[PDB]
Write a protein that binds this ligand. Structure first.
Ligand SMILES: O=C(O)CNC(=O)C(=O)O
Ligand SMILES: [Mg+2]
Ligand code: NI
Ligand SMILES: [Zn+2]
Length: 331
């Protein structure tokens, strides 16, 4: 078995190997990359996502989210308070203000220590979940707006044509902005490209050990667990690496820098934080190997998780027994 310790693997494809996206994902999996739940892909030196980022300031962040924490430094939840709209140029100036800017630090490890010590005492503002793309239309390789759609993959594997579309999302971050512990909708893959700015640190649990993380979460968030049998779908819970280590939960960590891709694999729980002002683009995708994970994915039916239009068909076809209850949650 390849990669039996479930380490995060880093890949350096050549420009020739960067042509065929599906084939390269399959290659990474042949080397055991999926066992980690997360892989890094460094593009060939010939490749670029677009020519420059000099003209992005007028993009609108319609609903910036202030991420307010509750709990203790290593075990907390966050809620999202909606703020007034602002442009990317306004948000960058805010990120760089004395109130929000990254503190002085020695290296990524020192900054990680400061994040876990101090995150709860601040409320950073995240420009998350903005439909759109920063890839140039002429970028032919690993263009996250030109991938094969999940609806087409389901149709190719299973023969059933379904409604829905699959488009990318932009994330504008600042110091301490946080993504809570989660797997993707319907335990899909994700791919994330860090277009510009400061790094993003990731934590990940191997898919084979995801249920260990879920059992810890039920212990640590006992009211949330009584409320919902899949409350990590709410995407609000944070647990620090120190707490994971104290409870014996297998996990790994890695820092993504500008110009790098990350791929998350089906049922790979992940969480993390931004180091300073940045912009990432991400989208979900599927392969043949995903189908069995989609059929088994947990679902929130309490009403909190509320998701996209296109998830309806995935539940309806892959999980017909659950469909009625899940849809009640959505309505
Ligand atoms: O970048 C973020 O805030 C969160 N991203 C992801 O969870 C992802 O790409 O799967
Ligand atoms: Mg602009
Ligand atoms: Ni994710
Ligand atoms: Zn729920």
């Amino acid at each position: 078995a390849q990669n039996p310790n479930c380490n995060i693997m880093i890949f350096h494809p050549t420009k020739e190997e960067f042509n065929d996206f599906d084939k390269y994902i399959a290659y990474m999996e042949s080397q055991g990359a999926h066992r980690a739940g997360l892989a890094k892909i460094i593009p060939p030196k010939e490749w670029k996502a677009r020519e420059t980022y000099d003209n992005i300031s007028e993009i609108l962040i319609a609903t910036p989210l202030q991420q307010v924490a509750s709990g203790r430094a290593g075990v907390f939840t966050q809620y999202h308070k909606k703020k007034k709209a602002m442009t990317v140029g306004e948000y960058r100036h805010l990120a760089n203000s004395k109130k929000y800017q990254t503190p002085p630090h020695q290296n990524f490890e020192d900054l990680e220590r400061k994040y876990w010590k101090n995150r709860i005492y601040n409320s950073p503002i995240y420009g998350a979940d903005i439909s759109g793309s920063l890839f140039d239309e002429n970028t032919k390789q690993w263009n996250l707006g030109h991938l094969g759609t999940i609806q087409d993959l389901l149709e190719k594997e299973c023969g059933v044509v379904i409604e829905g579309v699959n488009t990318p999302y932009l994330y504008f971050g600042m110091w301490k902005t946080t993504f809570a512990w989660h797997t993707e909708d319907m335990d899909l893959y994700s791919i994330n490209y860090l277009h510009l700015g400061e790094p993003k640190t990731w934590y990940v649990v191997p898919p084979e050990h995801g249920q260990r993380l879920e059992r810890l979460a039920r212990e640590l968030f006992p009211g949330s667990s009584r409320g919902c049998g899949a409350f990590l779908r709410h995407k609000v819970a944070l647990i620090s690496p120190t707490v994971l280590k104290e409870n014996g939960i297998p996990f790994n960590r890695i820092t993504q820098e500008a110009g790098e891709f990350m791929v998350t694999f089906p049922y790979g729980y992940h969480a993390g934080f931004n180091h300073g002002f940045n912009c990432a683009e991400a989208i979900n995708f599927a392969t043949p190997r995903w189908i069995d994970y989609g059929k088994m994915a947990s679902q929130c039916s309490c009403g909190e998780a509320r998701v996209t239009f296109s998830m309806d068909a995935f539940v309806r076809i892959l999980q017909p027994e659950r469909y009625d209850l899940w849809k009640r949650g959505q309505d």
